[PDB]
Amino acid sequence: HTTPWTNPGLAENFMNSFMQGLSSMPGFTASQLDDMSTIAQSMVQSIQSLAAQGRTSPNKLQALNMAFASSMAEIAASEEGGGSLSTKTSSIASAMSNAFLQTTGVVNQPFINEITQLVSMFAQAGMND
Amino acid sequence: HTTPWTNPGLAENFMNSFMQGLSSMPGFTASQLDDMSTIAQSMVQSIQSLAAQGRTSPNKLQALNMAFASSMAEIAASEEGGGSLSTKTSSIASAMSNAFLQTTGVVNQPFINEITQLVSMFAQA
């Protein structure tokens, strides 16, 4: 059960792989990708800082991986333009699948399912006020 | 720039206020509260770094505030012990309410409801 929350290096590699893959995928504008990359790099940096202090654990990395994926889902759902919501959702799922394959070598389907659900939940709910 | 979703200093205030509120609530072990505090501290520092570089925006702050809330929901849902799922849920909702009062003075109830829904979704997964 190697996952992106097994250790800091896999967590960082997963996030970087996701962004790399997404940026060749349909459905997103250049500024949407820029926002996602900015957040991705801030989270990689946060993990590097925690790791330097011996403050990561699988539970903390699992939560941080959810922080990352939920940020991506939120950007997808809230920034208008670039493609249909279903295209955005399928591109996120494809980029996550590839990110697993490139890093741990093993897709976590339950995680991909959670994130696709987040896209629809966030699109319906939204963020106003 | 009057809410945590548009003002980095208010976003940082909201996250610190959430943790302060949660630390007086039931349902979490000391280890779980440590996990939550560590993640909150990380997120606050991330926003401070981005703000210093002019790299925050309303869309990016919205995304980061949701990232924070989802990470709290995921800890509640996945880490066993310390209290029932309902207690954990109620405690997060209370700490979120107080975090709004301490920042904007106006509770965003639909946002609180959305986080309560995340706790259940993550728990079922």
mmCIF file of all heavy atoms in Angstrom, chain B residues 1-17 43-52 56-57 61 65 99 102-104:
data_model
loop_
_atom_site.group_PDB
_atom_site.id
_atom_site.type_symbol
_atom_site.label_atom_id
_atom_site.label_comp_id
_atom_site.label_asym_id
_atom_site.label_seq_id
_atom_site.Cartn_x
_atom_site.Cartn_y
_atom_site.Cartn_z
ATOM 1 N N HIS B 1 -11.789 43.575 -0.037
ATOM 2 C CA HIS B 1 -10.809 42.818 0.816
ATOM 3 C C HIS B 1 -11.247 42.756 2.286
ATOM 4 O O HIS B 1 -10.449 43.062 3.199
ATOM 5 C CB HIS B 1 -9.415 43.454 0.757
ATOM 6 C CG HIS B 1 -8.854 43.591 -0.629
ATOM 7 N ND1 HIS B 1 -8.220 42.556 -1.284
ATOM 8 C CD2 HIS B 1 -8.792 44.659 -1.466
ATOM 9 C CE1 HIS B 1 -7.819 42.968 -2.474
ATOM 10 N NE2 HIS B 1 -8.150 44.241 -2.610
ATOM 11 N N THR B 2 -12.499 42.359 2.529
ATOM 12 C CA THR B 2 -13.020 42.379 3.893
ATOM 13 C C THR B 2 -13.343 41.000 4.449
ATOM 14 O O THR B 2 -13.918 40.892 5.526
ATOM 15 C CB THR B 2 -14.296 43.231 3.997
ATOM 16 O OG1 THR B 2 -15.320 42.619 3.207
ATOM 17 C CG2 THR B 2 -14.047 44.643 3.500
ATOM 18 N N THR B 3 -12.997 39.943 3.714
ATOM 19 C CA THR B 3 -13.265 38.581 4.188
ATOM 20 C C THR B 3 -12.015 37.721 4.058
ATOM 21 O O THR B 3 -11.047 38.116 3.371
ATOM 22 C CB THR B 3 -14.360 37.904 3.366
ATOM 23 O OG1 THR B 3 -13.836 37.646 2.067
ATOM 24 C CG2 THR B 3 -15.628 38.781 3.250
ATOM 25 N N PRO B 4 -11.999 36.550 4.742
ATOM 26 C CA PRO B 4 -10.881 35.634 4.552
ATOM 27 C C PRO B 4 -10.740 35.121 3.132
ATOM 28 O O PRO B 4 -9.716 34.519 2.805
ATOM 29 C CB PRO B 4 -11.226 34.444 5.462
ATOM 30 C CG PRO B 4 -12.198 34.913 6.411
ATOM 31 C CD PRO B 4 -12.931 36.052 5.781
ATOM 32 N N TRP B 5 -11.754 35.316 2.297
ATOM 33 C CA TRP B 5 -11.650 34.812 0.924
ATOM 34 C C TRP B 5 -11.072 35.875 -0.024
ATOM 35 O O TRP B 5 -10.831 35.597 -1.211
ATOM 36 C CB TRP B 5 -12.989 34.238 0.419
ATOM 37 C CG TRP B 5 -13.534 33.093 1.279
ATOM 38 C CD1 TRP B 5 -12.887 32.434 2.314
ATOM 39 C CD2 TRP B 5 -14.835 32.497 1.190
ATOM 40 N NE1 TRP B 5 -13.727 31.458 2.865
ATOM 41 C CE2 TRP B 5 -14.918 31.485 2.192
ATOM 42 C CE3 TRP B 5 -15.948 32.706 0.352
ATOM 43 C CZ2 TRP B 5 -16.061 30.700 2.370
ATOM 44 C CZ3 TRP B 5 -17.093 31.931 0.539
ATOM 45 C CH2 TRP B 5 -17.137 30.928 1.530
ATOM 46 N N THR B 6 -10.850 37.082 0.515
ATOM 47 C CA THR B 6 -10.296 38.171 -0.282
ATOM 48 C C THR B 6 -9.131 38.906 0.387
ATOM 49 O O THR B 6 -8.475 39.704 -0.266
ATOM 50 C CB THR B 6 -11.364 39.224 -0.634
ATOM 51 O OG1 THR B 6 -11.919 39.749 0.583
ATOM 52 C CG2 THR B 6 -12.479 38.611 -1.429
ATOM 53 N N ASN B 7 -8.858 38.644 1.660
ATOM 54 C CA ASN B 7 -7.822 39.375 2.401
ATOM 55 C C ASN B 7 -6.893 38.351 3.096
ATOM 56 O O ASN B 7 -7.343 37.614 3.971
ATOM 57 C CB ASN B 7 -8.511 40.322 3.407
ATOM 58 C CG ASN B 7 -7.539 41.124 4.244
ATOM 59 O OD1 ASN B 7 -6.721 40.586 4.947
ATOM 60 N ND2 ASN B 7 -7.677 42.423 4.203
ATOM 61 N N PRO B 8 -5.609 38.287 2.696
ATOM 62 C CA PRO B 8 -4.740 37.205 3.255
ATOM 63 C C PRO B 8 -4.653 37.266 4.779
ATOM 64 O O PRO B 8 -4.633 36.209 5.436
ATOM 65 C CB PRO B 8 -3.355 37.487 2.626
ATOM 66 C CG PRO B 8 -3.641 38.215 1.395
ATOM 67 C CD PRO B 8 -4.884 39.090 1.683
ATOM 68 N N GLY B 9 -4.583 38.468 5.347
ATOM 69 C CA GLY B 9 -4.490 38.579 6.806
ATOM 70 C C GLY B 9 -5.735 38.022 7.487
ATOM 71 O O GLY B 9 -5.662 37.435 8.571
ATOM 72 N N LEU B 10 -6.895 38.244 6.875
ATOM 73 C CA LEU B 10 -8.126 37.672 7.435
ATOM 74 C C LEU B 10 -8.178 36.157 7.255
ATOM 75 O O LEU B 10 -8.673 35.450 8.155
ATOM 76 C CB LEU B 10 -9.352 38.336 6.824
ATOM 77 C CG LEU B 10 -9.600 39.783 7.227
ATOM 78 C CD1 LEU B 10 -10.913 40.195 6.575
ATOM 79 C CD2 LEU B 10 -9.727 39.898 8.774
ATOM 80 N N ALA B 11 -7.639 35.650 6.141
ATOM 81 C CA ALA B 11 -7.576 34.200 5.904
ATOM 82 C C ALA B 11 -6.700 33.564 6.989
ATOM 83 O O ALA B 11 -7.070 32.541 7.566
ATOM 84 C CB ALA B 11 -7.025 33.879 4.483
ATOM 85 N N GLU B 12 -5.571 34.208 7.305
ATOM 86 C CA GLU B 12 -4.652 33.670 8.340
ATOM 87 C C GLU B 12 -5.346 33.726 9.716
ATOM 88 O O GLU B 12 -5.325 32.747 10.469
ATOM 89 C CB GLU B 12 -3.363 34.490 8.356
ATOM 90 C CG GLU B 12 -2.546 34.391 7.026
ATOM 91 C CD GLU B 12 -1.688 35.630 6.787
ATOM 92 O OE1 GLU B 12 -1.416 36.377 7.762
ATOM 93 O OE2 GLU B 12 -1.256 35.867 5.626
ATOM 94 N N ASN B 13 -6.019 34.842 10.003
ATOM 95 C CA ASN B 13 -6.801 35.034 11.254
ATOM 96 C C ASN B 13 -7.863 33.911 11.376
ATOM 97 O O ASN B 13 -8.055 33.320 12.449
ATOM 98 C CB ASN B 13 -7.416 36.456 11.232
ATOM 99 C CG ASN B 13 -8.004 36.904 12.582
ATOM 100 O OD1 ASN B 13 -8.573 36.113 13.318
ATOM 101 N ND2 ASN B 13 -7.917 38.214 12.869
ATOM 102 N N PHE B 14 -8.551 33.643 10.268
ATOM 103 C CA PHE B 14 -9.630 32.663 10.293
ATOM 104 C C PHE B 14 -9.081 31.275 10.701
ATOM 105 O O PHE B 14 -9.660 30.574 11.547
ATOM 106 C CB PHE B 14 -10.282 32.624 8.923
ATOM 107 C CG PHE B 14 -11.411 31.649 8.829
ATOM 108 C CD1 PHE B 14 -12.725 32.065 9.058
ATOM 109 C CD2 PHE B 14 -11.174 30.302 8.542
ATOM 110 C CE1 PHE B 14 -13.783 31.148 8.969
ATOM 111 C CE2 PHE B 14 -12.241 29.366 8.472
ATOM 112 C CZ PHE B 14 -13.533 29.801 8.696
ATOM 113 N N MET B 15 -7.947 30.898 10.095
ATOM 114 C CA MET B 15 -7.359 29.573 10.373
ATOM 115 C C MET B 15 -6.863 29.468 11.826
ATOM 116 O O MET B 15 -7.140 28.488 12.521
ATOM 117 C CB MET B 15 -6.259 29.244 9.357
ATOM 118 C CG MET B 15 -6.876 29.169 7.954
ATOM 119 S SD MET B 15 -5.622 28.819 6.735
ATOM 120 C CE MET B 15 -6.619 28.973 5.230
ATOM 121 N N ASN B 16 -6.174 30.488 12.306
ATOM 122 C CA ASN B 16 -5.721 30.502 13.713
ATOM 123 C C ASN B 16 -6.892 30.496 14.698
ATOM 124 O O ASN B 16 -6.859 29.789 15.735
ATOM 125 C CB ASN B 16 -4.857 31.731 13.942
ATOM 126 C CG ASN B 16 -3.456 31.577 13.357
ATOM 127 O OD1 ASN B 16 -2.976 30.470 13.161
ATOM 128 N ND2 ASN B 16 -2.802 32.694 13.066
ATOM 129 N N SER B 17 -7.930 31.275 14.373
ATOM 130 C CA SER B 17 -9.134 31.357 15.216
ATOM 131 C C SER B 17 -9.883 30.010 15.235
ATOM 132 O O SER B 17 -10.396 29.587 16.287
ATOM 133 C CB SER B 17 -10.066 32.477 14.706
ATOM 134 O OG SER B 17 -9.511 33.799 14.951
ATOM 135 N N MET B 43 -0.659 25.998 6.544
ATOM 136 C CA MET B 43 -1.507 26.757 5.613
ATOM 137 C C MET B 43 -1.368 28.271 5.858
ATOM 138 O O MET B 43 -1.330 29.050 4.919
ATOM 139 C CB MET B 43 -2.985 26.317 5.692
ATOM 140 C CG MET B 43 -3.277 24.854 5.218
ATOM 141 S SD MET B 43 -3.063 24.498 3.422
ATOM 142 C CE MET B 43 -4.036 25.821 2.689
ATOM 143 N N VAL B 44 -1.309 28.657 7.129
ATOM 144 C CA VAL B 44 -1.144 30.075 7.480
ATOM 145 C C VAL B 44 0.190 30.582 6.911
ATOM 146 O O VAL B 44 0.246 31.667 6.299
ATOM 147 C CB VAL B 44 -1.209 30.294 9.016
ATOM 148 C CG1 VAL B 44 -0.686 31.674 9.414
ATOM 149 C CG2 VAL B 44 -2.660 30.064 9.555
ATOM 150 N N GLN B 45 1.261 29.802 7.111
ATOM 151 C CA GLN B 45 2.569 30.193 6.621
ATOM 152 C C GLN B 45 2.584 30.278 5.091
ATOM 153 O O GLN B 45 3.215 31.187 4.517
ATOM 154 C CB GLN B 45 3.620 29.216 7.158
ATOM 155 C CG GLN B 45 3.933 29.384 8.638
ATOM 156 C CD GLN B 45 4.708 28.205 9.230
ATOM 157 O OE1 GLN B 45 5.106 27.280 8.510
ATOM 158 N NE2 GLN B 45 4.942 28.238 10.543
ATOM 159 N N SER B 46 1.901 29.342 4.430
ATOM 160 C CA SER B 46 1.792 29.346 2.965
ATOM 161 C C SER B 46 1.136 30.638 2.457
ATOM 162 O O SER B 46 1.605 31.248 1.503
ATOM 163 C CB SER B 46 1.036 28.107 2.475
ATOM 164 O OG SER B 46 1.861 26.954 2.542
ATOM 165 N N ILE B 47 0.050 31.052 3.104
ATOM 166 C CA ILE B 47 -0.636 32.288 2.714
ATOM 167 C C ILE B 47 0.264 33.485 2.987
ATOM 168 O O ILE B 47 0.336 34.399 2.183
ATOM 169 C CB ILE B 47 -1.979 32.385 3.457
ATOM 170 C CG1 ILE B 47 -2.938 31.313 2.882
ATOM 171 C CG2 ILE B 47 -2.610 33.760 3.314
ATOM 172 C CD1 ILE B 47 -4.182 31.143 3.676
ATOM 173 N N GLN B 48 0.959 33.492 4.116
ATOM 174 C CA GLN B 48 1.870 34.600 4.406
ATOM 175 C C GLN B 48 2.946 34.720 3.314
ATOM 176 O O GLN B 48 3.221 35.825 2.832
ATOM 177 C CB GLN B 48 2.518 34.437 5.776
ATOM 178 C CG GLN B 48 1.513 34.557 6.920
ATOM 179 C CD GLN B 48 2.155 34.296 8.250
ATOM 180 O OE1 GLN B 48 2.843 33.288 8.445
ATOM 181 N NE2 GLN B 48 1.944 35.200 9.178
ATOM 182 N N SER B 49 3.527 33.586 2.909
ATOM 183 C CA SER B 49 4.551 33.561 1.867
ATOM 184 C C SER B 49 4.002 34.098 0.535
ATOM 185 O O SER B 49 4.642 34.942 -0.123
ATOM 186 C CB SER B 49 5.025 32.126 1.663
ATOM 187 O OG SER B 49 6.062 32.079 0.677
ATOM 188 N N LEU B 50 2.832 33.601 0.133
ATOM 189 C CA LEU B 50 2.242 34.035 -1.142
ATOM 190 C C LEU B 50 1.895 35.513 -1.107
ATOM 191 O O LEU B 50 2.120 36.218 -2.089
ATOM 192 C CB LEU B 50 0.987 33.224 -1.492
ATOM 193 C CG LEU B 50 1.222 31.761 -1.862
ATOM 194 C CD1 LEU B 50 -0.144 31.085 -1.956
ATOM 195 C CD2 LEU B 50 1.981 31.654 -3.182
ATOM 196 N N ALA B 51 1.329 35.968 0.023
ATOM 197 C CA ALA B 51 0.935 37.371 0.184
ATOM 198 C C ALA B 51 2.172 38.264 0.031
ATOM 199 O O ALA B 51 2.102 39.328 -0.629
ATOM 200 C CB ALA B 51 0.257 37.603 1.544
ATOM 201 N N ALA B 52 3.306 37.825 0.588
ATOM 202 C CA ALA B 52 4.547 38.613 0.511
ATOM 203 C C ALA B 52 5.019 38.775 -0.926
ATOM 204 O O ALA B 52 5.736 39.739 -1.264
ATOM 205 C CB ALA B 52 5.639 37.982 1.347
ATOM 206 N N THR B 56 -1.319 36.039 -3.916
ATOM 207 C CA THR B 56 -2.715 35.735 -3.543
ATOM 208 C C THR B 56 -3.704 36.458 -4.480
ATOM 209 O O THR B 56 -3.339 37.412 -5.214
ATOM 210 C CB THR B 56 -3.027 36.029 -2.062
ATOM 211 O OG1 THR B 56 -2.850 37.419 -1.819
ATOM 212 C CG2 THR B 56 -2.076 35.249 -1.130
ATOM 213 N N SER B 57 -4.926 35.947 -4.512
ATOM 214 C CA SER B 57 -6.008 36.544 -5.304
ATOM 215 C C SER B 57 -7.261 36.032 -4.640
ATOM 216 O O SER B 57 -7.184 35.065 -3.854
ATOM 217 C CB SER B 57 -5.956 36.075 -6.755
ATOM 218 O OG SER B 57 -6.334 34.714 -6.890
ATOM 219 N N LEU B 61 -7.244 32.524 -2.729
ATOM 220 C CA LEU B 61 -7.609 32.477 -1.297
ATOM 221 C C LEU B 61 -8.818 31.572 -1.072
ATOM 222 O O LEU B 61 -8.839 30.790 -0.127
ATOM 223 C CB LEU B 61 -7.860 33.880 -0.708
ATOM 224 C CG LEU B 61 -6.551 34.680 -0.519
ATOM 225 C CD1 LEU B 61 -6.861 36.167 -0.236
ATOM 226 C CD2 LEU B 61 -5.688 34.110 0.618
ATOM 227 N N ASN B 65 -8.674 28.375 1.335
ATOM 228 C CA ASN B 65 -9.565 28.281 2.512
ATOM 229 C C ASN B 65 -10.335 26.987 2.429
ATOM 230 O O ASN B 65 -10.558 26.324 3.439
ATOM 231 C CB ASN B 65 -10.518 29.480 2.588
ATOM 232 C CG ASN B 65 -9.884 30.688 3.276
ATOM 233 O OD1 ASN B 65 -9.180 31.464 2.642
ATOM 234 N ND2 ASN B 65 -10.192 30.878 4.563
ATOM 235 N N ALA B 99 -14.743 31.055 14.194
ATOM 236 C CA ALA B 99 -13.740 31.625 13.311
ATOM 237 C C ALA B 99 -14.355 32.743 12.441
ATOM 238 O O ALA B 99 -13.711 33.780 12.237
ATOM 239 C CB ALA B 99 -13.056 30.529 12.455
ATOM 240 N N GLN B 102 -14.981 35.780 14.755
ATOM 241 C CA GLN B 102 -13.738 36.443 15.144
ATOM 242 C C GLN B 102 -13.136 37.255 14.011
ATOM 243 O O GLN B 102 -12.259 38.091 14.270
ATOM 244 C CB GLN B 102 -12.679 35.416 15.608
ATOM 245 C CG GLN B 102 -13.064 34.693 16.896
ATOM 246 C CD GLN B 102 -12.988 35.637 18.074
ATOM 247 O OE1 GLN B 102 -12.052 36.436 18.176
ATOM 248 N NE2 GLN B 102 -13.931 35.536 18.978
ATOM 249 N N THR B 103 -13.584 37.002 12.768
ATOM 250 C CA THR B 103 -12.981 37.660 11.592
ATOM 251 C C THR B 103 -13.933 38.659 10.929
ATOM 252 O O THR B 103 -13.807 39.865 11.131
ATOM 253 C CB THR B 103 -12.437 36.640 10.553
ATOM 254 O OG1 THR B 103 -13.483 35.715 10.201
ATOM 255 C CG2 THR B 103 -11.254 35.874 11.117
ATOM 256 N N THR B 104 -14.909 38.158 10.179
ATOM 257 C CA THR B 104 -15.881 39.030 9.511
ATOM 258 C C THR B 104 -17.022 39.476 10.429
ATOM 259 O O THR B 104 -17.734 40.439 10.097
ATOM 260 C CB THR B 104 -16.518 38.339 8.309
ATOM 261 O OG1 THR B 104 -17.243 37.185 8.757
ATOM 262 C CG2 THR B 104 -15.451 37.887 7.298
#
